[PDB]
Amino acid sequence: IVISRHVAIPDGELEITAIRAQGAGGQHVNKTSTAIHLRFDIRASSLPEYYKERLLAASHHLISSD
Amino acid sequence: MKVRASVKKLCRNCKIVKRDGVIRVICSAEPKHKQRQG
Amino acid sequence: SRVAKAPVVVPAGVDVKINGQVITIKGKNGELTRTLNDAVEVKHADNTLTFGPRDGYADGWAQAGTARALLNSMVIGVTEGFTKKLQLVGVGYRAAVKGNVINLSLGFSHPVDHQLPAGITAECPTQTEIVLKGADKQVIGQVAADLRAYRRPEPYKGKGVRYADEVVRTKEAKKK
Amino acid sequence: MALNLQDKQAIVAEVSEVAKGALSAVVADSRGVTVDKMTELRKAGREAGVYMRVVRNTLLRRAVEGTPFECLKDAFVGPTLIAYSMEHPGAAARLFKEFAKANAKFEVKAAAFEGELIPASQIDRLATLPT
Amino acid sequence: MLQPKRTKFRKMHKGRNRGLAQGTDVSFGSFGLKAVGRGRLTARQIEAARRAMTRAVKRQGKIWIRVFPDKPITEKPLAVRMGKGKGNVEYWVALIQPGKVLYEMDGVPEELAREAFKLAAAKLPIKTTFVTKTVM
Amino acid sequence: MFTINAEVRKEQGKGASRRLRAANKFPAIIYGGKEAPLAIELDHDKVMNMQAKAEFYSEVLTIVVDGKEIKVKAQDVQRHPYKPKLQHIDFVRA
RNA sequence: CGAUGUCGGCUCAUCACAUCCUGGGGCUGAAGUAGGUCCCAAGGGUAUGGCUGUUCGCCAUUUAAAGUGGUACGCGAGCUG
RNA sequence: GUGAAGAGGGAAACAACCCAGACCGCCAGCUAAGGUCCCAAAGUCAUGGUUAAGUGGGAAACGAUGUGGGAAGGCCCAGACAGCCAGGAUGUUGGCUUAGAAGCAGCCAUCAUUUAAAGAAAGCGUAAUAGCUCACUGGUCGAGUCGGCCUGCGCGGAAGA
């Protein structure tokens, strides 16, 4: 449940990570306020087969080669 | 075997024992019914 | 309790003396000596083994039935002797007896050598079998289990040193 | 059972036959099959039928309590299960003949057809009767 | 979900929950589940237990739901500081005092009812107890 | 058959009732007719197994209270909310 | 707040076990090989680079594996800026 | 209410927690909270139960032939609980989809014979079978035994630098 337009896309298929930010804002942005999400989403897990096929086919940025 | 927090009588032959302080479910019929602590 | 309320009468001739708290059975298959827990009071008196539920030791009644079956099987062993028979199940397996040591091959690279304890005697009627005789039911049971533990039967065909009386289940592949 | 009065009902069912007892027929077949018992009952089924009462509640506290009203001779054998094959018109009937059939077919045991109540004999043959 | 249609007040106090229950009596059905514990019932929990009970009887009997949530407890959007007023209403909860009958059911046998009520038993957040409808 | 050997109460009130209810015996009272209302004590354990018999309500009780035996009828049943036990039952003097 | 110097890297570590590898086992929709999950185990071992200031990450190529974290998210009276 | 603006005794250490309001001296006595095996002052106190986990001396949903005490109930020397010695059948492929699916893929339904008893069926295994059978039914030993209910204390649940 991280709901899309058609598939409900179930939780468990997303690994939320927090990485130290990138900005010119002192101590807050460099260490503590990590608050940056590098969302780990993979195609192999329950995406409605055409969604899997129309994900690897049309290459795009933000997706890996795998 | 399968560890849990709840040992249950699943089959009709699954016997219950408190072996070595640990409650376990032995089964003389189905070998995949072996359970541990709980 | 139930079995504790059932006396054990020894077939005369197979002498039994009570040396304090250790029971000594002298018979035809040797001499058996085993200790006992301090909760049971024993007495031969006629030839009937009676066990007593002593006070204080609250596990005494449970200890009675325990000591009963032990001594029952003990005195029977010195008279006739206990027997186990294991079949060497498996194509290409070899098992033979050479003196007091067992030289067998479970299909391994190196021949497995097993040693007979004290009075346990081994012989093989056929190349694919072993039969063990002895006095105690523990030592006869241990070696039968240890030889089974060298190679347990498979769940696909059943190759291995198993008990001739124990039936193994028969599984089969998922689709092939 | 289903009730102790049903156990008492089985007791009074036995006394209905003991009040009409003429002979005594024993069968100690401890090892038998359903069809084995049926093969003997079809011989009884076409001679008489269900009339040959086979109420087997032969405990020492069951059958022994249901016999002493009349023909007390079978109380000495009492227990150790006896498959009774007795009927009302059983006075010198073909009941002894039905056991020799079983000794040749499927049963090596049938209490060796003894006979206790008035056959004027024991385990040995009973053929000379007004049957 | 069970929500009050046209509520007078959008948000009320979190108050207190004490004393022994009110609905001790069972009259509509014949067998009912009672709450021996003391806690809170969320809207989703009661709808989950309604679905997890309508499965076992497969359209037989007559299921009753004694309580209605009617009290909106609230949560705030995380990472906000305290103050500025109460949060937005999220879900409705009913307070349960010990001895409250939750469900009622009849049109089912005594044996089947004891088993089906075990299904909803693990779906609710407090301690359970099974009872039956008696005269008086 | 519904005969209960009962005793009378020497004390009453809120805590006093809980004092004896903890001693495995609950209170009850009989009213009706024109006579005086009598607060009667009776053991708890027996009644829970006696009320299990459904005829207990509809049939006329015949309990005794220190010599004089009075025939009664059950009026109210106050069960403990969550715990399976009784607290107080009302008796119509009938 | 009459100062407790700030990410990353470097050097140097050290502990936890919720174990990445090696080890010992239960089970299988476990034939064999190879895999899946769970349990016991912290002794030791636990990548070089391209790009980025980076941690993170992607990619190339490896390896038995390239574990996850605590330690002022270790370590600036040790270095770097 | 206390601390703040009250020290003293106890809660190991601990302003606010429990007891208690320091005028000074004393090598004097009686109590409070809390304690009385040793460190450490005083009970290895008396009597009668209780736990086997070092619980006690960190915690839940839930699980469990742990175990103590209490009440009722089912069955029980016209002999049970459990094993053992025998059976588990009579039409049947159950009609129906009978495409191969024989009580053993599945709708749905389900009577009566032999009787001390046996569900047109409890399960593994089978395209479909067989076997073993679990129910339920006879003898053997023959003493109590079985299932829940209310509570006392415990077990597991329970992994960090």
Min Cα–Cα distance to chain E from F66, Å: 29
Min Cα–Cα distance to chain F from E9, Å: 32
Torsion of CA F66, F70, F76, F77, to 10 degrees: 50
Strand partners, F27: F41
Q: How far is Cα D95 from Cα D85, in angstroms, rounded to an integer?
A: 7
What φ, ψ does residue A28 adopt, rounded to 5°? -60, -60
Of the partner residues F57, F82, F83, the one whose CB lies closest to the CB of residue E136: F57
Alpha helix (H) ranges present in C22-126?
A: 60-77
Q: How far is Cα C167 from Cα C165, in angstroms, rounded to an integer?
A: 6
Domain spans of chain E, in order of start: 21-136
Q: How far is Cα F45 from Cα F87, in angstroms, rounded to an integer?
A: 12
Which has the closest alpha carbon to D113: D25, D45, D29, D11? D25
Grouping H, G, I as helix, E, B as strand and the rest as coil, residue C64 is helix
Neighbours of F30 (CB within 10 A): 25
Q: Which residues lie closer than 8 Å to B8 by C-beta, 6 or more apart?
A: B25, B35
CB–CB of F82 and E34 under 8 A? yes
Nucleotide nearest to D78 (CA to C1'): H139
Min Cα–Cα distance to chain F from E84, Å: 42
**CA B38 → C1' G72, Å?**
41
**Looking at beta carbons, which residues of chain F come within 8 Å of E135?**
54, 57
- Amino acid code (one letter) for D113: F
Q: How far is Cα A10 from Cα A3, in angstroms, rounded to an integer?
A: 7
Strand partners, C87: C129, C162
Encoding tokens for residue E116?
């089906």
**CA D38 → C1' H119, Å?**
21
Domain spans of chain D, in order of start: 1-130
Contact assessment for residue F27 and residue F20, using Cβ atoms and an 8 Å cutoff:
yes
The pairing of beta strand C48-53 with beta strand C40-43: antiparallel
Documented resolution in Å? 3.5
Backbone dihedral region for residue A46 (phi beyond 0: left; psi -120 to 50: alpha; all else: beta):
left
Q: Strand H: which positions are within 7 A of a protein CB? A: 53, 61-66, 70-73, 75-80, 85-90, 114-118, 122-123, 126, 137-143, 145, 149-151, 155-158
DSSP characters for C135-154?
S-HHHHHHHHHHHHHHSPPP
Element (H, E) at C17: strand C16-19
Neighbours of A42 (CB within 10 A): 14
Min Cα–Cα distance to chain F from E36, Å: 5
Backbone dihedral region for residue A9 (phi beyond 0: left; psi -120 to 50: alpha; all else: beta):
left
Q: Which residues lie closer than 8 Å to E7 by C-beta, 6 or more apart?
A: none
Of the partner residues F57, F77, F82, the one whose CB lies closest to the CB of residue E99: F82
SS3 assignment for A8-56: CCCCCCCECCEECCCCCCHHHHHHHCCCEECCECCCCCCCCCHHHHHHH
What φ, ψ does residue C80 adopt, rounded to 5°? -105, -50
Q: Distances in Å between the alpha carbon of A54 and those of A2, A12, A13, A57, D127?
A: 20, 22, 18, 5, 97
**Looking at beta carbons, which residues of chain E come within 8 Å of F80?**
99
Q: How far is Cα A15 from Cα A39, in angstroms, rounded to an integer?
A: 6
- Amino acid code (one letter) for C76: I
Q: Strand G: which positions are within 7 A of a protein CB? A: 6-8, 26-31, 38-39, 53-60, 73
Domains and CATH numbers, chain F: 1-94 (2.40.240.10)
Q: Which residues lie closer than 8 Å to E17 by C-beta, 6 or more apart?
A: E38, E40, E95, E96, E97
Domains and CATH numbers, chain C: 8-80 (3.90.930.12), 86-162 (3.90.930.12)
* Chain E with chain F: Cβ pairs closer than 8 A: 23
Q: E with F: 3 or more CB pairs under 8 Å?
A: yes
Nucleotide nearest to D28 (CA to C1'): H139
DSSP state for residue D86 in the 8-state scheme = B
Alpha helix (H) ranges present in E73-135?
A: 110-121
Residue located via tokens 């089906």: E116
Q: Which residues lie closer than 8 Å to E118 by C-beta, 6 or more apart?
A: none
Any idea how long chain A is?
A: 66
Task: Report the CATH fold assignment for D1-130.
Answer: Alpha-Beta Plaits (3.30.70)
Q: How far is Cα E117 from Cα C71, in angstroms, rounded to an integer?
A: 52
Q: Distances in Å between the alpha carbon of F48 and those of C75, F24, F77?
A: 56, 11, 11
Q: Which residues lie closer than 8 Å to D22 by C-beta, 6 or more apart?
A: D86, D90, D91, D92, D117, D118
Q: How far is Cα D25 from Cα D115, in angstroms, rounded to an integer?
A: 5
CATH class entry, domain E21-136: alpha beta
Contact assessment for residue F91 and residue F31, using Cβ atoms and an 8 Å cutoff:
yes
Neighbours of B22 (CB within 10 A): 11
Q: Which residues lie closer than 8 Å to E89 by C-beta, 6 or more apart?
A: E10, E11, E72, E74
Scanning every residue of chain F, which has its alpha carbon at the shortest distance from the alpha carbon of E131? F84
In F1-94 the beta strands, taken as DSSP E runs, fall at 5-8, 25-31, 38-43, 64-65, 68-69, 73-79, 86-92
Q: How far is Cα F16 from Cα F9, in angstroms, rounded to an integer?
A: 10
Encoding tokens for residue D103?
């000794």
Neighbours of F73 (CB within 10 A): 16
Q: How far is Cα E32 from Cα E21, in angstroms, rounded to an integer?
A: 15
CB–CB of F81 and E99 under 8 A? yes
Q: How far is Cα E51 from Cα E65, in angstroms, rounded to an integer?
A: 12
Encoding tokens for residue D41?
């009952």
